[PDB]
A paper describes a structure:
As the first reported host of “non-pathogenic-derived” pili, [name] is a gut-adapted commensal lactic acid bacterium (LAB) and one of many clinically investigated probiotic strains for human use in the prevention and treatment of certain gastric ailments. As with other Gram-positive bacteria, sortase-dependent piliation in [name] GG (called SpaCBA) is assembled from the ~30 kDa [name] (backbone), ~20 kDa SpaB (basal), and ~90 kDa SpaC (tip-located) pilins. Two immunoglobulin (Ig)-like subdomains comprise GG-[name], each having the conserved residues of a canonical E-box motif and internal isopeptide bonds formed between either lysine and asparagine or lysine and aspartate residues. Our findings show that the GG-[name] structure has certain features in common with other pathogen-derived pilin-proteins, such as the Ig-like CnaB-type folds and the presence of internal isopeptide bonds6940.
Crystals of full-length GG-[name] protein belonging to the monoclinic C2 space group diffracted up to 1.9 Å resolution at a synchrotron source (BM14, ESRF). Crystals for full-length GG-[name] contain three molecules in the asymmetric unit, where the head of one molecule faces the tail of another. Each GG-[name] molecule is made up of two Ig-like domains connected by a short linker with an interface area of 641 Å2. The two domains are bent by a hinge angle31 (i.e., the angle between the principal ellipsoid axes of the domains) of 152°, in which the N- and C-terminal domains (N-domain and C-domain) consist of residues 39–175 and 176–302, respectively. The electron density map clearly shows continuous density for two intra-domain isopeptide bonds, one for each domain. Formation of the isopeptide bond (K-N) in the N-domain occurs between Lys47 at the end of β-strand A and Asn172 at the end β-strand G, which corresponds to the pilin motif found near the domain interface. On the other hand, isopeptide bond formation in the C-domain is between Lys184 from β-strand A and Asp295 from β-strand G, and involves a proximal catalytic Glu269 in a hydrophobic pocket made by Tyr276, Phe198, Ile293, Phe182, Phe245, Phe253, Ala196, and Leu193. Intriguingly, the three molecules present in the asymmetric unit of the GG-[name] crystal are seen to generate what resembles a pilus-like fiber, and where the corresponding pilin molecules are in a “head-to-tail” arrangement that may reflect its native biological state. Along the axis of the pilus structure, each of the GG-[name] molecules shows a rotation angle of ~120° and translation of ~78 Å. The inter-domain hinge angle (152°) in each GG-[name] molecule and the head-to-tail positioning of adjoining molecules allow for the formation of an elongated spiral staircase-like arrangement that could then offer both flexibility and rigidity to SpaCBA pilus structure.
Numbering used by the authors: 38 to 302
Write the structure that this text describes.
Amino acid sequence: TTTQNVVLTKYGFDKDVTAIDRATDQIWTGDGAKPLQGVDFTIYNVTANYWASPKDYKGSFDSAPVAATGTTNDKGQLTQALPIQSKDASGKTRAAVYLFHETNPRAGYNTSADFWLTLPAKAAADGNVYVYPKNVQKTTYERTFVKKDAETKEVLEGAGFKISNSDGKFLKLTDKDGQSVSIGEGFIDVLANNYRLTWVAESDATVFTSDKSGKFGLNGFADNTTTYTAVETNVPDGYDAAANTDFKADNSSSDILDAPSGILP
C-alpha cells in the first residue's frame, strides 16, 4: 500500500559538458547547470510488461498503464508518489517497475532516453528517490533585423513583418503545447519562453514588429542552412514597403530599409 516519492530533476549543461551519473540516494543541486522548466514526462507502470519476462525486458511500455504525467517546475523538478508494489499481468503482486518517458523536451534540448527502475529504490536521507535524466543542449540559431528609415538611417519602430519558408508557408509561434501566444514587439526569445516554430497559412502567421530600437527577430531556429523570407506586412505611414528579405538563421543582424514615400508638387 506504501509509496515512494520519486523526484525527477532536469538539469541543462553547456553543450560540451557531460554530467556524471548520480545515484537515487544523492540530492544533487546541479552545480554548473540550469534547471529546465516545462519538460513533460509520462510515467508508465511497466510492472506487467517487465514481470512477463524480466530477462527480456528492454523498456517496452506498450499497453502499459499511465502511472502519472508531470511537467518540470522552475527548479527543473517534478515529484510523484509511486506505489512500491503493483500487479503483474496475471494479478500477482510484484515489486513495481516504472518507466519514465519524456514527451516534450524544452526548446533547445534533445529528448532524453527512456529509463526505468524497480521500487523500492535506495532513497536519500529525506526518504525521496532522485533521478536525473540527461538533456543534451542542441545548437539552435537566431536572426535579428533592424528596421531603419532609408533616408535618415534612424531606427524605425512599429513596422510589422511575417516570415515565410520556401513552401510558401508562414511562421507562427506557439507555446510548448501548440497553443497560440500573443507575440509582442522586438526580438522574440523562443528559447527562454519555450515556444515552438510552426508553419501555417499567411493569415494565421505571427507578426513580428520592430521595437523602439528598430529590432525584431527570434531565436530557436533548427538550422542555419534553410532560407526564409521576411515580408513587410505592416508599413509605417509615410513609408514605402521594403523589398522582401531573404535570409538564413545564421545568428547575424542586418538592416531592413524603409524608404520615405515621395510627395511630388
